[PDB]
Amino acid sequence: MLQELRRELEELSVGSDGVLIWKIGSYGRRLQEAKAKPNLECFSPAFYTHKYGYKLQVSAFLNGNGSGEGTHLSLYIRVLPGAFDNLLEWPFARRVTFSLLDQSDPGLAKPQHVTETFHPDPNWKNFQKPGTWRSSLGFGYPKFISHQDIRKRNYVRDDAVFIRAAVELPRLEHHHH
Amino acid sequence: MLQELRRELEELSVGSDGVLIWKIGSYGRRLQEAKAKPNLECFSPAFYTHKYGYKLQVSAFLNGNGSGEGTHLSLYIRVLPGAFDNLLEWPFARRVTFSLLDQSDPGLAKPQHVTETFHPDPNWKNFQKPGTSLGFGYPKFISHQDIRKRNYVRDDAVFIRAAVELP
Amino acid sequence: MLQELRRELEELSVGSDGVLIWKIGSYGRRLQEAKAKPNLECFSPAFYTHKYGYKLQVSAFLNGNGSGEGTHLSLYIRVLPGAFDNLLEWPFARRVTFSLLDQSDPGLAKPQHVTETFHPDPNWKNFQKPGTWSLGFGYPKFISHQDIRKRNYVRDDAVFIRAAVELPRLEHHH
Ligand SMILES: O=C(Nc1nccs1)c1ccc2nccnc2c1
Ligand SMILES: O=C(Nc1nccs1)c1ccc2nccnc2c1
Ligand SMILES: O=C(Nc1nccs1)c1ccc2nccnc2c1
Numbered sequence: 001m002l003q004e005l006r007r008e009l010e011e012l013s014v015g016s017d018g019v020l021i022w023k024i025g026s027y028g029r030r031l032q033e034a035k036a037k038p039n040l041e042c043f044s045p046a047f048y049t050h051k052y053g054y055k056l057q058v059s060a061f062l063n064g065n066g067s068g069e070g071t072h073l074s075l076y077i078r079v080l081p082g083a084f085d086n087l088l089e090w091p092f093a094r095r096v097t098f099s100l101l102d103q104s105d106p107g108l109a110k111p112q113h114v115t116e117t118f119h120p121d122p123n124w125k126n127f128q129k130p131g132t133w134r135s136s137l138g139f140g141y142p143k144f145i146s147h148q149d150i151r152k153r154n155y156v157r158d159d160a161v162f163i164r165a166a167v168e169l170p171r172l173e174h175h176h177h
Numbered sequence: 178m179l180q181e182l183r184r185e186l187e188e189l190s191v192g193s194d195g196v197l198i199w200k201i202g203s204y205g206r207r208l209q210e211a212k213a214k215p216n217l218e219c220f221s222p223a224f225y226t227h228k229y230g231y232k233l234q235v236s237a238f239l240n241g242n243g244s245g246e247g248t249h250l251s252l253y254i255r256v257l258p259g260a261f262d263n264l265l266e267w268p269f270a271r272r273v274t275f276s277l278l279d280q281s282d283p284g285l286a287k288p289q290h291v292t293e294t295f296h297p298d299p300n301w302k303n304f305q306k307p308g309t310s311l312g313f314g315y316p317k318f319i320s321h322q323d324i325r326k327r328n329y330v331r332d333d334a335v336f337i338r339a340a341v342e343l344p
Numbered sequence: 345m346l347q348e349l350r351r352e353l354e355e356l357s358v359g360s361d362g363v364l365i366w367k368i369g370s371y372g373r374r375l376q377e378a379k380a381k382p383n384l385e386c387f388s389p390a391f392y393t394h395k396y397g398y399k400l401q402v403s404a405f406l407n408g409n410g411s412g413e414g415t416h417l418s419l420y421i422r423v424l425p426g427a428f429d430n431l432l433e434w435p436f437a438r439r440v441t442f443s444l445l446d447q448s449d450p451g452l453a454k455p456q457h458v459t460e461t462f463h464p465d466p467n468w469k470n471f472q473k474p475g476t477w478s479l480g481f482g483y484p485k486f487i488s489h490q491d492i493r494k495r496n497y498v499r500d501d502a503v504f505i506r507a508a509v510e511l512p513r514l515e516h517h518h
Pocket of ligand 1: 041076
């Protein structure tokens with residue numbers, strides 16, 4: 001079926017340091033479609049923070065929404081219902097970094113990524129345990145990058161863009177006892 | 178093929194990590210099924226100890242078998258024929274830890290897992306090289322009364338953890 | 345579709361430190377198939393050096409090609425076009441190690457793998473950026489037909505080809 005294809009798309013990546021790299025291809029056609037249909041939303045494959053961890057999903061508005069409608073690219077992340085939610089602490093409080101990657105060869109010039117970092121609001125409600133609020137609203141930036149800034153370097157290359165969503169590892173001390 | 182590909186897909190979800198977390202949902206329906214059919218066996222997805230390592234499988238009796246039939250949940254592990262068996266040392270002698278997990282929020286109370294650990298017996302026929310079942314485990318892993326004593330059954334679901342030691 | 349089992353074979357292997365273990369079964373049937381069709385090439389599943397890294401593929405001539413046709417097994421590796429090529433440095437310059445494994449129990453006797461190692465030449469054509477420029481790189485005489493039978497290289501009518509790519513470790517400030 002098509003859920004089988006979605007499953008295989010999800011397995012990149014398995015609980016890998018919270019790092020998802022989402023390639024949005026045919027950039028011009030998707031941008032035209034978004035300009036023709038306001039509030040057109042693209043969805044990344046669902047990805048887990050760690051093995052048996054939080055299930056997250058990144059979404060993008062190529063023509064922007066909210067304060068960025070028509071002028072910017074908008075980036076959001078949302079917690080999804082996961083099979084292991086009962087084994088994780090809530091609310092979700094792991095630091096997240098969005099990045100629009102500069103597709104430049106690292107050997108000829110240092111890339112300048114458009115990077116932003118945020119800490120989940122304990123009161124954002126969506127970062128609370130799934131199934132508590134029967135919003136459904138991702139958290140992020142409506143003005144992540146402007147339409148003019150996205151053409152200023154190698155952000156769009158071969159009609160494709162790269163969005164890197166990295167979730168921070170908590171790191172703790174023992175315990176021991 | 179589609180059903181068998183679903184199978185292979187849920188096999189990939191595990192690793193290679195050596196840590197398997199097996200979620201058994203609709204606990205009540207399956208417990209009644211096991212009570213209606215003695216020795217009814219549930220099977221975990223096959224999972225590898227490491228990349229290109231031993232292929233293992235966990236099996237469970239929700240109504241118990243052997244000394245625990247009708248009173249306990251029984252947990253066993255068995256070695257399966259793996260594609261890389263000719264590249265591994267035998268007999269399988271890596272420490273194994275079974276856990277029935279307490280589905281409690283770690284931020285509100287520290288969970289109390291029901292854990293058991295064993296080292297593979299060199300003379301247990303199943304831990305020998307396949308072809309050159311015979312599962313090993315505990316018939317009295319947890320009693321029917323103790324499995325209701327905390328958050329072991331939550332939202333009609335149970336979690337069986339099987340952790341294999343690193344080389 | 346059937347193309348999905350192919351991708352399930354792929355990512356059952358890729359993410360690891362550039363280490364692909366390719367199991368070629370029914371060795372005898374495929375060997376006489378290659379003997380019946382010169383230059384018959386077997387292909388490993390595509391595998392990535394790291395997550396979002398280079399996409400590589402190993403290929404084999406069971407009856408050999410080039411200087412080893414009819415006498416040896418020939419082993420090659422090739423860079424394939426990957427979705428993240430624009431985020432990687434070129435040319436590919438990660439050291440590669442081929443190994444034919446001696447399928448012997450490591451606890452009763454030490455295996456003797458047939459191992460060869462190379463560092464990719466920066467002026468090699470295939471190691472340049474895919475599309476922005478098929479000649480794989482490798483060994484035509486990796487192992488002879490007689491040497492592949494001398495130990496447990498062929499066991500239970502199966503062979504194991506290990507291709508390991510070395511990872512770097514560059515770093516900066518605090
Ligand atoms: O209002 C939003 N976000 C924030 N407000 C404050 C901080 S982040 C917002 C708007 C539209 C969305 N469409 C899809 C997914 N998530 C969305 C989130
Ligand atoms: O007798 C068993 N185990 C032990 N005997 C002694 C120590 S552990 C036993 C019983 C039932 C099983 N059903 C399925 C798979 N494996 C099983 C193993
Ligand atoms: O000429 C080759 N390799 C080298 N030449 C010099 C050093 S390694 C060669 C020959 C045949 C091939 N057939 C398929 C894939 N790759 C191949 C590579």
